Structures are given as structure tokens and as C-alpha cells.
Short mmCIF file of C-alpha atoms in Angstrom, two decimals:
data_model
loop_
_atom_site.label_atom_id
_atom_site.label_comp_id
_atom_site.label_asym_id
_atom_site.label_seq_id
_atom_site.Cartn_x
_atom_site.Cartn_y
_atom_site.Cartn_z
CA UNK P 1 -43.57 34.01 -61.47
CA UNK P 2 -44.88 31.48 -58.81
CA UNK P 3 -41.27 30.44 -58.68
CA UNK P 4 -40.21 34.15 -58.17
CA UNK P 5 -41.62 32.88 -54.44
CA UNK P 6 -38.86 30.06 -54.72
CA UNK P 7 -35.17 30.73 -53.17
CA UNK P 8 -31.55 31.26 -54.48
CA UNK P 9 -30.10 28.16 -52.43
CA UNK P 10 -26.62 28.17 -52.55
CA UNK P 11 -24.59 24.69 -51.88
CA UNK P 12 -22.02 23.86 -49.68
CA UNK P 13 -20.09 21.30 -47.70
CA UNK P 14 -20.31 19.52 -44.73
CA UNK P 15 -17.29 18.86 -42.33
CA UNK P 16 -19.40 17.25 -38.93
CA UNK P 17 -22.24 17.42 -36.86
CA UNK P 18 -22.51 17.97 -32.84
CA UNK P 19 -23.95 15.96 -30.41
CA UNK P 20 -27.61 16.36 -28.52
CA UNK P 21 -28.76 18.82 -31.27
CA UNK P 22 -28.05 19.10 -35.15
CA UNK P 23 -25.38 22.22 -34.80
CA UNK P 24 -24.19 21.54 -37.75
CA UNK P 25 -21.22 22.90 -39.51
CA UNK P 26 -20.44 23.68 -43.15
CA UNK P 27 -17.48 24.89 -45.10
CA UNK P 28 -19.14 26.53 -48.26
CA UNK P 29 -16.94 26.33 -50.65
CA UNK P 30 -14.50 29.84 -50.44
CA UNK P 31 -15.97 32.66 -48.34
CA UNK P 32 -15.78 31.10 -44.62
CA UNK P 33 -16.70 28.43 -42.43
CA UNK P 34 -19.95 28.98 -40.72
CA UNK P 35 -21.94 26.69 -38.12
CA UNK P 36 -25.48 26.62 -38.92
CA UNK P 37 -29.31 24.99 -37.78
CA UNK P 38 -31.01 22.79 -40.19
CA UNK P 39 -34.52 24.26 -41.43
CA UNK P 40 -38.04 22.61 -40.80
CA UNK P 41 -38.65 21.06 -44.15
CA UNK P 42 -35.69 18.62 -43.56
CA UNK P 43 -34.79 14.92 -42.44
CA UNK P 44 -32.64 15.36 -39.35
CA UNK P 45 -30.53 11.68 -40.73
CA UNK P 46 -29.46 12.12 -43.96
CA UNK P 47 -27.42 14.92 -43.35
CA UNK P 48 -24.09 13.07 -42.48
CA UNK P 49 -20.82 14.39 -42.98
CA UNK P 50 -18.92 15.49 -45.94
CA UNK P 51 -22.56 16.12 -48.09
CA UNK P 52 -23.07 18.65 -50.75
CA UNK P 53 -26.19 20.02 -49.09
CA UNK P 54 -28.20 23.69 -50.50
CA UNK P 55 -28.17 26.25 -48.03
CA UNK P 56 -30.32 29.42 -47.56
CA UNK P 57 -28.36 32.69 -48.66
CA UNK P 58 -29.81 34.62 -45.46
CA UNK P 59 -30.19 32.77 -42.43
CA UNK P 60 -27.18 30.18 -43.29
CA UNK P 61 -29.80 26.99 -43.23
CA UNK P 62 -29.63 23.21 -44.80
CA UNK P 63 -32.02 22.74 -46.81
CA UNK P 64 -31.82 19.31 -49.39
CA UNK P 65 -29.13 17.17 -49.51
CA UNK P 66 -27.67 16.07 -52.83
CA UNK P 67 -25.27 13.73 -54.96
CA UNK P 68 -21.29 14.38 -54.78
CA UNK P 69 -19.77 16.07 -57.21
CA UNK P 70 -18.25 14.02 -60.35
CA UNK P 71 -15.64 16.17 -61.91
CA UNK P 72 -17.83 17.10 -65.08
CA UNK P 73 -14.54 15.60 -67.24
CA UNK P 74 -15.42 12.17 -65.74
CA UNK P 75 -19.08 12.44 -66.67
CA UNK P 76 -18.41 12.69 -70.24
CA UNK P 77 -17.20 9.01 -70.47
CA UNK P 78 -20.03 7.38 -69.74
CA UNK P 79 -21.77 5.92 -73.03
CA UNK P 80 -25.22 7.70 -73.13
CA UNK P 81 -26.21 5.78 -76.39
CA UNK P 82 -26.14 1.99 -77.51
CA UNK P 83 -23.45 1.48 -80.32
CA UNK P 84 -25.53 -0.73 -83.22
CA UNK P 85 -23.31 -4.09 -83.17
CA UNK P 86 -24.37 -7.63 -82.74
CA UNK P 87 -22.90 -10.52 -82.15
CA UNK B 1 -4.74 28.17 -32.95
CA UNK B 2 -8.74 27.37 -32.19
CA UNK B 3 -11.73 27.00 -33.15
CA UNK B 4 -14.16 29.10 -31.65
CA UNK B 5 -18.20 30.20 -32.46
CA UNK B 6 -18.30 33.84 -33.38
CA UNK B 7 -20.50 35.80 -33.79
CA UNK B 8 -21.00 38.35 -37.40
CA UNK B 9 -21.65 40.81 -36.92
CA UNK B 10 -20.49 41.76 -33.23
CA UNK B 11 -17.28 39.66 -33.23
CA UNK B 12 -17.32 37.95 -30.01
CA UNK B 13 -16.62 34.49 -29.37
CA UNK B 14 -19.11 32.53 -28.33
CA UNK B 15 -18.45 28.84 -28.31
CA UNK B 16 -15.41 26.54 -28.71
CA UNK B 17 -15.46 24.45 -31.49
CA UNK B 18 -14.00 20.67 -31.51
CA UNK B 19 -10.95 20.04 -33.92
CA UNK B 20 -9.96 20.99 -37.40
CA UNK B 21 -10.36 17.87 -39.24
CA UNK B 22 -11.29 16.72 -42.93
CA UNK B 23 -13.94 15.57 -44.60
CA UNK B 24 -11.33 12.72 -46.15
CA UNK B 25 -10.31 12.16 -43.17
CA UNK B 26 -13.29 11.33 -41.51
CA UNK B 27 -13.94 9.26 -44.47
CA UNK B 28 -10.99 7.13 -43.77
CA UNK B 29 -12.84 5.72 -40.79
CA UNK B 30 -12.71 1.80 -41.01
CA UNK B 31 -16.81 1.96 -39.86
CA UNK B 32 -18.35 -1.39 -41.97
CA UNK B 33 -16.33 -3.86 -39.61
CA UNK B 34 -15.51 -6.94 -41.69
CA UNK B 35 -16.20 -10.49 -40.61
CA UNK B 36 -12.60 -12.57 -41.85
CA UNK B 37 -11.87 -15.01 -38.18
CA UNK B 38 -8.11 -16.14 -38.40
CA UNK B 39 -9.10 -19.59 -39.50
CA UNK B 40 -10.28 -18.16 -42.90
CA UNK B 41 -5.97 -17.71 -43.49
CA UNK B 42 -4.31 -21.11 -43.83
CA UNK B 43 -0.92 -21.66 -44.10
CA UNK B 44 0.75 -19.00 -42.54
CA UNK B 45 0.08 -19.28 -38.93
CA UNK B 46 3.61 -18.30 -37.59
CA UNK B 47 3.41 -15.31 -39.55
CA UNK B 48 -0.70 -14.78 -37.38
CA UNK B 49 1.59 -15.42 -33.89
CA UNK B 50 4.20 -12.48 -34.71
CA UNK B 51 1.56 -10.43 -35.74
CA UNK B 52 -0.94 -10.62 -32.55
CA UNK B 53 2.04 -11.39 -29.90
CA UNK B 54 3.60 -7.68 -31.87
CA UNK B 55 0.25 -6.03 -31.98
CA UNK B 56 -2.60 -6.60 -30.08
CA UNK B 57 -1.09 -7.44 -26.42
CA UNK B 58 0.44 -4.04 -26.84
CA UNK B 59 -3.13 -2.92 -27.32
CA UNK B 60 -4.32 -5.31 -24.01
CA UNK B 61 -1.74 -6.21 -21.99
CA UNK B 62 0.54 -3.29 -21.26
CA UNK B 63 1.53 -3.71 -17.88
CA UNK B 64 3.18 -7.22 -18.74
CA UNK B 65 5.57 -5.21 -20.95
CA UNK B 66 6.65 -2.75 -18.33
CA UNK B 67 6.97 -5.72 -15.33
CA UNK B 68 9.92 -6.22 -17.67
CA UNK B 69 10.41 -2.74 -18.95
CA UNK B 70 11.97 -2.69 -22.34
CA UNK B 71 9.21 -0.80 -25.27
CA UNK B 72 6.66 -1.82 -27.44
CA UNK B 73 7.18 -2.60 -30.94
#
């Protein structure tokens, strides 16, 4: 219930920035294309192009940037245990 | 066929975006600039010579094409 106070933050895509402010501009992922501000709890660097960042549901606002996505077929290929054989 | 800022509720442009380009695209952007000089090839130095003399003096010295007027490459 103290993360009832926490937010919804949906995530989106970045296409570019602008120059002599952030500006920034996001495709989300189906509804639109919106250009948007960057909130106050952020690093104004690592939020370079083409960057699955979580954005504020309201106000349209970037809030933590994230890792790419890995086509969840792809990630089920890696080993995740250790085989017992020796040599 | 542009971009332009609008606003949501009201519907009025406000602002003129750039260009309508992807994220792949942008990613295709030779940016880490490799260090290989032309003496790290051996060996096929007439092959170098037809390559600069049909590239790069297109890219710097364009007026000593037209002087006698034919087309780049």
C-alpha cells in the first residue's frame, strides 16, 4: 500500500532528440507519436535514441531508461544451469 | 506530408518537426570511426589507386571534373 503511491509507467520508444533542450520524441509502441519533456528524477545523457524508456501515463514524461528488448524466444536458449560433465 | 507539433486536445499545429526517419536507420550511422591507414593493405595497390582516383576526388575535387565536363563515376 506504500507502493499504491508508486506509478503505472508505461514504456515506449525513442526515435531522436532536439537540439538546445531535451524535446524529446517517442513513438510508444501503437497509439501515436507524441513529443514529450523528460521528468526531474532523470539523467539528461543516457537517453539516446532508439531506447526502451518508461513513460508517465498522464503528462507523457521519461522516466528510466532500460535494456532492449530480446524476443522472449531468443531468451530461452541461453543455458541457465551447468550440465554435470567433466573432462 | 509533414511533421508538425500539435496540440491534443485543441488541434492546432504548433511546431514543425524535422524528418521521418528510423530508429534502424539512425543506427546505421558509421559513428566509432576505425583506424585501418592504406599501408595496413599490401598487395593490391592498383586496386587502392582506382578506388580513391573513382571515389574520393569526386568527394574533393569537383571542379577538375567539370573543367573537362564529362560525369562522375
Amino acid at each position: 500500500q506504500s507502493e499504491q503511491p508508486l506509478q503505472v509507467a508505461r514504456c515506449t520508444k525513442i526515435i531522436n532528440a532536439d537540439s538546445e533542450d531535451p524535446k524529446y520524441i517517442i513513438n510508444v509502441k501503437q497509439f501515436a507519436k507524441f513529443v514529450v519533456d523528460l521528468s526531474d528524477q532523470v539523467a539528461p545523457t543516457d537517453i539516446e535514441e532508439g531506447m526502451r524508456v518508461g513513460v508517465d501515463r498522464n503528462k507523457y514524461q521519461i522516466h528510466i531508461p532500460l535494456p532492449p528488448k530480446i524476443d522472449p524466444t531468443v531468451t530461452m536458449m541461453q543455458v541457465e544451469e551447468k550440465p554435470d560433465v567433466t573432462y | 506530408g509533414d511533421l508538425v507539433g500539435v496540440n491534443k486536445d485543441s488541434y492546432l499545429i504548433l511546431e514543425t518537426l524535422p524528418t521521418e526517419y528510423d530508429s534502424r536507420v539512425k543506427a546505421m550511422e558509421v559513428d566509432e570511426r576505425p583506424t585501418e591507414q592504406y599501408s595496413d593493405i599490401g598487395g593490391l595497390d592498383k586496386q587502392i589507386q582506382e578506388l580513391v582516383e573513382a571515389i574520393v576526388l569526386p568527394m574533393n575535387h569537383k571542379e577538375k571534373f567539370e573543367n573537362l565536363g564529362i560525369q562522375p563515376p
